[PDB]
Structures are given as structure tokens and as C-alpha cells.
Subunit: 455 residues, 2 copies
């Protein structure tokens, strides 16, 4: 136990702030940082068992090799609380790590380095170098469309895919979809992985926007990113991520262009008087004009009229204004293009001046109105489940629930709005379970059960 | 148009005005202060009144109200209504800079237009909007905004948070001679500050609730308009430019800071504020998370600060101070000391000591306008002295049990005096002191009153079981 080093506070700060990223404590040692002195390099490692961040620091002042682990937040808070220009002397003593700087002495408790978890090494299948700005672009373009604590864990992450000369990101939560692709100047093998949420955040955090390039390595179950003296490694998420190609409108035949800023501020004002639960707003598009309207159960109303570029047929179409605003914020461009097919068909939004990013939002139709799903929900069903569904189909249709039955599968294509704005992966199998218990199907009873159970 | 009652309704809903967005923003922000609370629907609304050539905006939460006057330089019609505050403000804020906002009423709705943006807001009758009961001031005076800002910022941090003693959650405003004074305390630490305001004032002592203090701070614009204050028996009012703030006062027996200040500090220590703060801040990192205790070792022109935690981690800071006198060791809750040092914002700090078991006064070395009291921490259980001895009414039965149990309680670090029908707690062990003894002790006394024997071990077990 004789690791030792002395470093100027300035050189230690940024690496410490960085490796305290993977860091409510999960388990004791995961709140600690692994410190390794080897050669003339100090290595700092932070991990949460799903990912790890390693930071290297060159040591010019005297040092002895060794390794230990110390509380991350405490060690960092001490360094940060010392004056600018200060010197930080570290030294192991027994089961304690001593930190000195001037007449400030600190004794921290340690846990052995040999107990610090390692990631089992792996083999990269893909390797490429790209500018930091490019990676930051790809993530910021799609990050907001990631799911949050979905039961489908693969949606809580971000798809990274290499195709030809391009790196692509995809994110969706089942209600909306963000896709962005950028060239990276070299032919790559076809690969497709899901990076979990925390990893994407951490990946974004290690990028300073600098012109020094990012080195990426992708294996089957791990991804590794090297920038400057930082090395980020993360586990990948398994699961069948949906295919963005099927989500894009088949063929838009109507398109409008508008100033991003004006359209966004207009939607933002309208949203104030939209339903707080469903957040619907109406668009009426006509020649070179757009009329946005919103109202709520208190029958308050907002109306916005903008000049736009549009020469298609007039059309009325509703949206979740929160999803539209999310897209317009992420774009941050001059003009936006909205590609439309018809109400009841998915809408595609892009920067008017570039096709690198594309966004998909489902319209809101306005007995009960059947709202189309972003992605049709396909579910395996037993003979008994199937029979219950077929008996209840017409009763379900009256509630706005449309579906198709294959041999041993059902495909939900539409549901009423209150269900669509929730997780159908959870709700529909509950609905199926409930239906299998019945022999007589009426819309009233079903509606009442859904109303009291699926909400 | 021809219906007579229908005509009266139209004359009732004539309110109309047109104002620049930038003339409306700061006033809407200001009056939305007292307000996401679903307390009552009407309380989420602003009152709008066009009278004379002035638009008045009023927001309230029934404990206080903020009124803003806006001069109307464009055509307008008199009238009144109420509209949802957050919505109306978000609409105005969301409109482009330089926008003209035209408002008028149509039935039970308020219409807002600007360019080609139209909004329809639901209203509630102005008649239903609460009006604070009229009252008469007993004291009027004016002072610079910066002085009020100083008085409040010097003491605000020491106010209790959600204490069951509501008077501790507010701030004492006191007029004495030519000075305005603020006092705040949570039973554990105390902040007092006084400023001369250049005029003789009648003696007065009121408690402004926390929300009132915050609002009072929010209406100070660092401009050069003076602040005109009115204090009544049960209300306070503050006028700044186009804003009038009114607040109900809190009643209760606020502690006397005169008694909390150390009687006669025979030792003093001076030190650079920033140096001292940074030393404490670093030492704090390795102090007990619950008790936050650090030790001072004072010697000739040297201060050593130490801290350790249950994991036996350890911090030490040695810095140069100005000090002549006997060596002494004293302990503090570092969080309270760090609060004080952050509030001082000065070059040098004076620390007036006497000993442990005695309150410690802290000041700007160059200014005595503000003073801060913290109680030392002593590390038979150590008896930690209370900032304010707790005087409790006791029944004959309760007093009898206390007399019997006094020796046992003393072993637990609980010290108290007793007088005809009262008992005065002067000290308790540390875990009790850092809690609310106004709740805990009357409970404990209830317990002791129901007991046959008094063994310190048993009582200590009970306390730890029920009072923590």
C-alpha cells in the first residue's frame, strides 16, 4: 500500500469531474474511484457496472506506482475546495489514503483495488474515427425521443448503426421517432447496436466539442469511445429495436415549409391553452398559410396564423404539440419542412435545408376516434385469446380499437387516444387477458373496464 | 343590444386596454409571486382593473397580496375582471419582443390579441376576488431599498423551515429609536441586523411570514426609488415605485436576541473571511453527516480545524489567525458556521468566545451592524447548551416526576432549572438539541410523569426509541 503522486489541482480537476459521471448509491465500492499509478500515468476509473469511464493524467512530479479506491465525491469535493494553483499530494497509508495540500490534511478510507470490478475484455467488430461535433450532432438530434423507464428496455436506449459510409442514430418511445445519419468518410461493415440511456448521456458528457477526434470501437455487446485522455466503455442493450424505415411515411405528397422560430413560438403560445393531458392542437394548412388552434375543457381557445410556403390541397390535422415542439427545439435551424400524406398518416419533419435528420410524429384525429399507432403492435395469441378477440372485434371497433388477426398473431393498428398516449405493450395484453374471461362482448362494459383499469 | 339588463352586462364588461408587452411583463412577474397551488381557483387568477388612466394588476394568496400599477398611454375603457395568472403571463411572455397586447372582454371571456395571435381566457367576477381587510398603519417611514435588502439578506438564512412554531418561520422586523432591525432564528442559530434609517420611530415589533419576506425581497429592483413602509398591528405594507406589497403578520412570542447574545465574551479571534470559509468548507466534507460537528483548536495566532466521521475519515486545516489569549478547544455545527460566513461577505471575521457551554457571537470584523449566534458543540453524556432555554409550563404531577428524575436525566446530559409551575431546559444531549425540543420535551415530560422509578439507562432507551 504505497501508491503516491503529486499533481497540480488544475490537472486533476477535469479528469475527476469526468470519471464521477458513471456515478442514491447502488453498492459501496461503486461510489469509489479506482486510482492507479503506473509508469508516469495516473489512471482514474469510475464505474456503475453497466459502463466505465477511465481518465489518464501524466505525472511529472515524483510518484510511486500502486493502486487503491477512494470515495469519489469526497475526493473530488476536497480537490475542488482547494485554492486555484494549489498542489495536491496523495499517498497511501495503511487502509487510508492521505491527501495533503498546504496545511490541509485529509485521511480517506479505502477499499482494495483488487475488489474493483473489471469489464471482461471483448473484440471490436467495427472501428472508426469521427469528429466530436459529428457524434454530438447525432446524439443531440435524437436523444429527446428516447423512452423513459419503458418496460421494453431497448427503447430506453439509442440505436447506433453503421451503413455504407454513414453513422446513424435512432430513438423512439413508441409514440414518436427521431433518426439522424452523418457521413464519416469511410466504408464500414453493417452494424447495429443499442447504447443504454446513461451511456448516451455519459458519451455526450465526455465530448468538449473539440477538433481532436473521437475513436469508436463497437463489439457485439460493448462500445468504446476514446477522446483525448478519456476512455468510455459501455455495455450494449439487447432487444429488437424497431425499424425506422417502416416508421417513415411511405410517400408524402404534401409538404410545407416555415420559419422554424416563428412556427415554434406559435405552437408554444397555442400549447398554453391546449388540453393539459392530451396536448392536442389543430393545424389548418391552406395556400401559403397555417392556422394553429388549441382549446381545453374550460373552452379557452388559442389561434395563431402564420405565413408559410404551401400550395397543396387544404388540410386539417391534429398533433401532440409537445412532440412537435420537441422536434422544433432539436432542429434549431432556419426553416423546417413538414411532409404530410393525410390526417391518420404519420408525419415527417425535417430541417428544410438538410435531410440528415428526420422526425416522425403521429397525427391526432378529431363512435370513438381510432388513433393510428406509430408502430403496429404485433402479439402472439393462443387459440382461446384469438377467439375472444374475434368475438369482441366489432365491439372493440366501436371504441376506436382496430386490429388484424393472422394465424397465431394479432396486429393492433389503432386505439383510442387515451390508450395511444400510454404503453400499449403493457395495456393491450391486459386487455386481451380481460377479454378471454368473457363470453358476451358489449362496447359499454369494455369501455368501463378499460376506463377503470388501463389508465 | 336592446335588452336593458343585457345592456348593463355590456357596461359591466367594458374593460379594455392596449399596452406594450415590455410594460406588462415585469408587473405580471411581480404579482404572480404570491402564487402551482390549487388552493382555490380564484387564487390562481389575477385581478385586472382599468380605472382612471391606470391598469391595476393584483395577485394574492390570502396571507399577502401584490399590486402593480401600470400607466395606460393608449386608449382604454374602465372595468374589472380576473384571469388565470400563469396563462395570461405565459401568453404575454411568449409573444415577440415589442408586441402590442390588446385586451377586452366578451361575455365571460377575456380576449387577448397581438398581431395575428388570438387568445380566449375564461374569467371569474372581479367581485369575487378577495380584498384584504382595510387597516390603519401605526408606523410609517421610508428607507433606501438597499438598506431593506441588506437587513433581509443578513438574516434570512437563519429563519426556520416548516417549524411547528410558525413565528420562527418568519422574520422579526423591529423599530427602535432610529434603527430598523431584523431578527431570524430556528432555535438552533440566530441572525440579527440593524440599520439606522435617519428618523425617530415609534417602538414596534412584528413578525413577517417567510413568503412575505421573499416577496419583499423580490420587489427591490436595485434602482433609486425609495421604499415606503407601513406597519400596522396585524399587517405590513411596502410601496416601491409602481408596486404595493401587503402582508399579514404572524403572531407569537418571538425570542429576544438580547438574551441570546453572549453576555460578556472574554476572548476574540479575527481571521480572513474567505480563508476561514474555505477551511471550514473542506473540513465539513469529512464531518459527521448528521451532526456536522467540527473542532476548533485556538492558540497564539493560529487556528486548527478538525473533523471526523463514523468511518474514521479525518480532516485537518491549519490557518493563520489574529489571536492572543489562552489556548481553547471548542466545537461547532460547521453548516451553521458556513451559513454565517457566506452571509458576511466581508474581508475579516471576528469570533467572540467565552467557552464551551456558552453561545458564540460572530461578526464582520469591520462592522457590527450584524451579529450571529451559534451554540458550541461539546465532544455522563455531554450536555449541549440550548440557544434559547426552553421554558415549559408543568403540572404538579409533572413537576414531581421531574424532581425525582432530575439526577437520572442529568446523567443523560439533560439539564434544567425549575421555578413555581415551570421548568426551564438549559441543555440536552446533542441528538436532541439538533431537533425541535418544543415538541420532544413536553412529550418526554409526559412520559416521566407516568413512571415509578427513574433509571438513566431505561429512559435513554425510551428516548432513543420514541423521540428520534
Amino acid at each position: 500500500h504505497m501508491m503516491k503522486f503529486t499533481v497540480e489541482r488544475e490537472h486533476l480537476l477535469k479528469p475527476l469531474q469526468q470519471v464521477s459521471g458513471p456515478l442514491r448509491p447502488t453498492l459501496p465500492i461503486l461510489g469509489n474511484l479506482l486510482l492507479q499509478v503506473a509508469d508516469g500515468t495516473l489512471s482514474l476509473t469510475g464505474t456503475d457496472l453497466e459502463m466505465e469511464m477511465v481518465a489518464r493524467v501524466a505525472l511529472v512530479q515524483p510518484h510511486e506506482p500502486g493502486a487503491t479506491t477512494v470515495p469519489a465525491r469526497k475526493f473530488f469535493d476536497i480537490c475542488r475546495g482547494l485554492p486555484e494553483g494549489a498542489e495536491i499530494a496523495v499517498q497511501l497509508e495503511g487502509e487510508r489514503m492521505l491527501v495533503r495540500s498546504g496545511r490541509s490534511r485529509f485521511s480517506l478510507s479505502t477499499l482494495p483495488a483488487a475488489d474493483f470490478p473489471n469489464l471482461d475484455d471483448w473484440q471490436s467488430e467495427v472501428e472508426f474515427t469521427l469528429p466530436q461535433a459529428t457524434m454530438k450532432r447525432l446524439i443531440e438530434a435524437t436523444q429527446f425521443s428516447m423512452a423513459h423507464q419503458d418496460v421494453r428496455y431497448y427503447l430506453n436506449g439509442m440505436l447506433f448503426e453503421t451503413e455504407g459510409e454513414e453513422l446513424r442514430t435512432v430513438a423512439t418511445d413508441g409514440h414518436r421517432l427521431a433518426v439522424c445519419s452523418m457521413p464519416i468518410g469511410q466504408s464500414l461493415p453493417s452494424h447495429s447496436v443499442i447504447v443504454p440511456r446513461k451511456g448516451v448521456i455519459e458519451l455526450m458528457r465526455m465530448l468538449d466539442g473539440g477538433d481532436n477526434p473521437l475513436r469508436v470501437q463497437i463489439g457485439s455487446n460493448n462500445i468504446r469511445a476514446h477522446v483525448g485522455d478519456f476512455i468510455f466503455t459501455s455495455k450494449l442493450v439487447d432487444g429488437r429495436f424497431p425499424d425506422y424505415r417502416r416508421v417513415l411515411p411511405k410517400n408524402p405528397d404534401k409538404h410545407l415549409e416555415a420559419g422554424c422560430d416563428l412556427l415554434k413560438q406559435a405552437f408554444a403560445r397555442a400549447a398554453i391553452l391546449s388540453n393539459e393531458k392530451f396536448r392536442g392542437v389543430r393545424l389548418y394548412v391552406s395556400e401559403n398559410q397555417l392556422k394553429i388552434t388549441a382549446n381545453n375543457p374550460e373552452q379557452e381557445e388559442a389561434e395563431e396564423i402564420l405565413d408559410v410556403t404551401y400550395s397543396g390541397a387544404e388540410m386539417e390535422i391534429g398533433f401532440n404539440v409537445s412532440y412537435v415542439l420537441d422536434v422544433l427545439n432539436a432542429l434549431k435551424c432556419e426553416n423546417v419542412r413538414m411532409m404530410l400524406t393525410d390526417s391518420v398518416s404519420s408525419v415527417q419533419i425535417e430541417d428544410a435545408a438538410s435531410q440528415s435528420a428526420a422526425y416522425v410524429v403521429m397525427p391526432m384525429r378529431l363512435p370513438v376516434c381510432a388513433q393510428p399507432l406509430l408502430i403496429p403492435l404485433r402479439l402472439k395469441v393462443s387459440a382461446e385469446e384469438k377467439s375472444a378477440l374475434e368475438k369482441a372485434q366489432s365491439a372493440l371497433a366501436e371504441l376506436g380499437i382496430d386490429f388484424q388477426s393472422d394465424a397465431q398473431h394479432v396486429t393492433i393498428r389503432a386505439v383510442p387516444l387515451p390508450l395511444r398516449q400510454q404503453n400499449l405493450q403493457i395495456l393491450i395484453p391486459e386487455l386481451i387477458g380481460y377479454l378471454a374471461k368473457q363470453s358476451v362482448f358489449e362496447p359499454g362494459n369494455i369501455a368501463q373496464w378499460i376506463a377503470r383499469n388501463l389508465m
